Amino acid sequence: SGFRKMAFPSGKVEGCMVQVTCGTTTLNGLWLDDVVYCPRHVICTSEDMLNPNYEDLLIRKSNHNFLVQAGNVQLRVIGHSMQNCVLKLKVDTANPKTPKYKFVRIQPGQTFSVLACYNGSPSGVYQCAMRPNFTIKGSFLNGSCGSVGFNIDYDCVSFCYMHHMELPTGVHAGTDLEGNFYGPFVDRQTAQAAGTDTTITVNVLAWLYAAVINGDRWFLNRFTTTLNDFNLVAMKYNYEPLTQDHVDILGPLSAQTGIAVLDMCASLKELLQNGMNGRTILGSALLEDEFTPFDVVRQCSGVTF
Amino acid sequence: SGFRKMAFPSGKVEGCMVQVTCGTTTLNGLWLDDVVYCPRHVICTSEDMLNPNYEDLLIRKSNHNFLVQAGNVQLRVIGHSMQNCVLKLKVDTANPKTPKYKFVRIQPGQTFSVLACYNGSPSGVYQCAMRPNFTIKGSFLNGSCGSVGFNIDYDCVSFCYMHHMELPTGVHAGTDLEGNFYGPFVDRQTAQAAGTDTTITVNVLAWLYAAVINGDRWFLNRFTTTLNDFNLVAMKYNYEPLTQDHVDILGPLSAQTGIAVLDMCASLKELLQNGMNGRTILGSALLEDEFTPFDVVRQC
Numbered sequence: 212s213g214f215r216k217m218a219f220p221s222g223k224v225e226g227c228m229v230q231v232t233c234g235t236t237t238l239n240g241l242w243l244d245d246v247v248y249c250p251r252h253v254i255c256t257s258e259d260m261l262n263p264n265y266e267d268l269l270i271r272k273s274n275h276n277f278l279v280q281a282g283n284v285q286l287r288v289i290g291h292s293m294q295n296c297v298l299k300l301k302v303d304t305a306n307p308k309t310p311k312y313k314f315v316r317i318q319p320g321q322t323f324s325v326l327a328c329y330n331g332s333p334s335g336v337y338q339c340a341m342r343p344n345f346t347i348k349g350s351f352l353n354g355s356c357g358s359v360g361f362n363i364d365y366d367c368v369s370f371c372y373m374h375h376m377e378l379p380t381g382v383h384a385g386t387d388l389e390g391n392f393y394g395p396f397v398d399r400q401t402a403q404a405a406g407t408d409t410t411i412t413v414n415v416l417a418w419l420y421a422a423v424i425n426g427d428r429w430f431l432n433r434f435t436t437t438l439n440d441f442n443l444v445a446m447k448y449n450y451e452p453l454t455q456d457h458v459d460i461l462g463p464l465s466a467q468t469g470i471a472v473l474d475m476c477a478s479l480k481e482l483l484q485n486g487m488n489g490r491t492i493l494g495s496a497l498l499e500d501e502f503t504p505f506d507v508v509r510q511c512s513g514v515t516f
Numbered sequence: 517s518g519f520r521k522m523a524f525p526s527g528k529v530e531g532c533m534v535q536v537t538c539g540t541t542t543l544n545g546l547w548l549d550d551v552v553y554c555p556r557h558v559i560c561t562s563e564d565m566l567n568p569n570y571e572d573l574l575i576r577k578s579n580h581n582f583l584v585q586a587g588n589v590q591l592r593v594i595g596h597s598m599q600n601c602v603l604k605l606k607v608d609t610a611n612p613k614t615p616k617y618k619f620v621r622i623q624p625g626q627t628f629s630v631l632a633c634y635n636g637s638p639s640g641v642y643q644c645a646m647r648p649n650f651t652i653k654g655s656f657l658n659g660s661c662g663s664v665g666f667n668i669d670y671d672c673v674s675f676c677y678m679h680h681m682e683l684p685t686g687v688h689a690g691t692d693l694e695g696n697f698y699g700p701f702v703d704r705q706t707a708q709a710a711g712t713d714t715t716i717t718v719n720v721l722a723w724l725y726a727a728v729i730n731g732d733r734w735f736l737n738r739f740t741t742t743l744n745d746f747n748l749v750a751m752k753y754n755y756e757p758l759t760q761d762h763v764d765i766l767g768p769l770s771a772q773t774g775i776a777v778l779d780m781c782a783s784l785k786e787l788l789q790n791g792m793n794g795r796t797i798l799g800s801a802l803l804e805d806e807f808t809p810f811d812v813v814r815q816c
């Protein structure tokens with residue numbers, strides 16, 4: 212029993228964290244095989260971050276300008292190239308700790324673990340979700356850039372995020388491992404604002420199934436609804452639309468608990484229009500939306516890595 | 517900026533997780549140097565559930581009765597001894613991945629990361645607090661016994677917990693790495709009940725300072741309180757008494773934010789009286805008590 216926000220074991224990723232220093236800037240890099248990936252803004256100065264020409268700044272750099280440090284060992288940079296907002300530094304040594312990995316771009320609502328690093332050293336691991344507005348509500352201080360988000364499928368690490376910046380509201384923005392930003396963000400010091408966020412509906416429903424699996428049933432009602440009636444209520448409360456794909460994905464949880472997806476939707480619909488009434492679900496007074504249907508199944512089944 | 521429940525990176529601990537099988541029972545072990553630590557209840561049969569005599573059951577065991585598996589490699593057990601509720605299995609191979617480590621017994625309110633394992637394989641990592649009633653509100657299924665709680669402060673892993681059992685309310689009980697249980701619990705299937713839990717007051721206050729550091733000030737007030745008056749109010753909301761030690765520990769956060777501890781205590785009194793009023797503090801509609809003053813400073 213019990214339900215916790217649980218991250219993937221970070222060991223396979225810790226063996227890849229390195230420190231990348233370019234001039235006065237020091238951030239983290241991801242060392243996979245003979246390549247070190249890091250945010251391209253590591254080559255920026257104070258004037259350069261205001262309006263940057265990264266092709267021009269990178270052309271002025273040489274391999275010895277990048278100081279890469281894996282533990283207490285300096286790696287020699289033998290090449291540098293840029294892929295979108297990520298800098299790739301070819302090194303002379305392949306990382307012996309390179310796990311089986313893939314680079315995957317995730318969709319809003321999907322969750323992943325973040326290994327927060329400072330100076331190439333892992334300091335914390337937390338779980339989070341790609342918000343519908345493409346930000347992550349992370350926990351990052353100065354020096355955390357280059358920290359990565361990942362999932363684990365069997366023995367394979369899927370890298371899905373690299374930290375680039377913090378927005379004025381304290382939320383975070385970054386890219387996939389190909390340097391493509393999540394959201395309408397650019398890697399420059401300029402006025403940027405995250406759009407109004409919405410609740411990840413399929414995730415709230417999965418967390419309601421997790422609560423039922425853990426013995427919390429007070430919110431269940433005799434009612435069911437249509438996907439049409441439910442999405443009208445969802446739009447009204449700044450909740451993401453629930454598609455037939457989401458209903459299908461929630462199928463195994465619906466079968467395991469005996470509560471049809473549209474029946475759980477009628478519970479959510481009532482919870483939105485009426486509230487908790489001083490009650491809690493899984494020790495929370497708010498509806499949790501950072502557990503996907505797969506996270507719930509994985510935690511309430513005991514899948515290992 | 518931002519505030520999250522954050523666990524320590526679990527890599528140093530993953531390299532120590534092994535599977536321990538004794539007869540039909542399979543749980544997890546912690547392999548440090550040439551010793552594998554695991555709950556002593558791994559030697560229990562269906563008959564040894566209510567009243568096991570562990571000294572008697574262990575004496576009937578031989579080294580070849582314990583099957584230890586590190587990855588896909590079976591380790592050879594060359595000795596077995598018991599220290600309180602933990603079984604120690606001497607193996608013929610020192611773990612090459614053994615980190616710098618210590619065994620530390622923690623106090624209620626203290627937080628730690630849990631590496632949840634099944635069959636010697638790490639499946640998840642989460643942050644926990646030792647509740648005032650000496651239980652942990654974990655997330656554990658059958659087979660998770662032997663999963664450990666730890667802190668990784670500067671290079672060294674401090675092991676503070678080993679999972680042993682789940683109580684009837686779904687809360688969890690375990691021991692330090694010397695086999696001494698946290699709480700009035702025994703490793704028997706006998707009727708055991710966790711005492712009524714209370715909120716870790718010093719931790720709520722630390723989390724309120726984290727909220728102020730992150731720009732949340734709506735809950736602050738112009739009031740201060742005496743420590744005794746705060747405690748008389750707090751105890752009525754099932755909160756732990758705040759001692760002078762707690763007030764002293766909150767000192768650096770008080771200095772950093774310019775809000776005196778007893779002034780933050782008056783804001784906490786008001787929050788217990790009024791509730792949130794639809795508002796949230798650090799994205800939470802409840803007062804969070806699983807961040808210690810040391811966690812808040814570390815994260816901020």
Ligand SMILES: O=C(Nc1cncc2ccc(F)cc12)[C@@H]1CCOc2ccc(Cl)cc21
Pocket residue numbers: 212557656657658659660661680681682683702703704705706
């Ligand atoms: O606590 C136990 N099991 C489990 C532990 N942690 C989560 C569990 C979750 C589910 C589950 F089925 C078993 C779980 C076992 C078996 C029940 O009785 C006792 C009594 C004393 C001792 Cl030391 C251990 C146990």
